[PDB]
Design a protein around this ligand. Sequence first.
Ligand SMILES: O=C(O)c1ccnc(-c2cc[nH]n2)c1
Ligand SMILES: [Fe+3]
Length: 330
Amino acid sequence: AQNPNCNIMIFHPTKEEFNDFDKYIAYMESQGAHRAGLAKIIPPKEWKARETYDNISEILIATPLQQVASGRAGVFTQYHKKKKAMTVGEYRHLANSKKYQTPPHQNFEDLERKYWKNRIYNSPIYGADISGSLFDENTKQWNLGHLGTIQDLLEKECGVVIEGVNTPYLYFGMWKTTFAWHTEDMDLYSINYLHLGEPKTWYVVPPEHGQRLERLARELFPGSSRGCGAFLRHKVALISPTVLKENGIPFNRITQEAGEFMVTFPYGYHAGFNHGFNCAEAINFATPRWIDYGKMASQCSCGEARVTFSMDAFVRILQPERYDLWKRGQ
Ligand SMILES: O=C(O)c1ccnc(-c2cc[nH]n2)c1
Ligand SMILES: [Fe+3]
């Protein structure tokens, strides 16, 4: 078996290897990449997402979210308080202000220590899930706005045409901006490109060990767990690497820098934080190997998890027994 320790693999495709997205995903899996839950892909030195990031300041963050924490430094939840709209230019200025700017640090490990020590005592503001793309329409390879859709993949594998669309999202981050422990909707894959700015540190649990994280979360967030049998779908819970290690949870970490792709694999739990002002683009995708994961994905019928119109059909086709209850919660 490839990659039995479930380490995060890093790939350096040639320009030739970079010409067929599905084929390279499959190659990575042939080398055991998926066992870690996360892989990094460094694009060929020849490649670029777009020419310049000069003229992005006028994009609108219609609903910036302030991420307010409750709990302890290593075990906390966060809720999203809506703020007034601002442009990316205004958001960048805010990110770099004294209140929000990255503090001095020696290296990534030092900044990580500061993050887990102090995150809960600040409330950074995030631009999240903004439909759009910063890829040049002329970029022909690994353009996240030109992938094949999940709906077409489900039709190709299962024989049934479904409604729905599948488009990328932009994320504008600042220091301490946080993404909670989660797997993707329907335990899909995701691909994330860091377009510009400061890094993003990721934590990931191997898919074969996802249930261990779920058990620990139920212990650490007991009220949340009683309210919803899949409360990690709410995407509000944070658990530090120190607490994970104390509880024997297998995990790995890696820092993504501008110009790098990260792929998240089905049922790979992940979380992380931004180092400073940055912009990332992400989208979910599917392969034939995903189908069996989508059939088994847990669902929140709490009401709390955010439903896209596109997910209805995945539950309807792949999980007909669960569909009624899930639909009520949406
Ligand atoms: O903020 C980010 O960079 C980030 C990282 C990993 N996952 C998501 C996500 C959003 C919805 N599903 N997954 C967003
Ligand atoms: Fe994600």
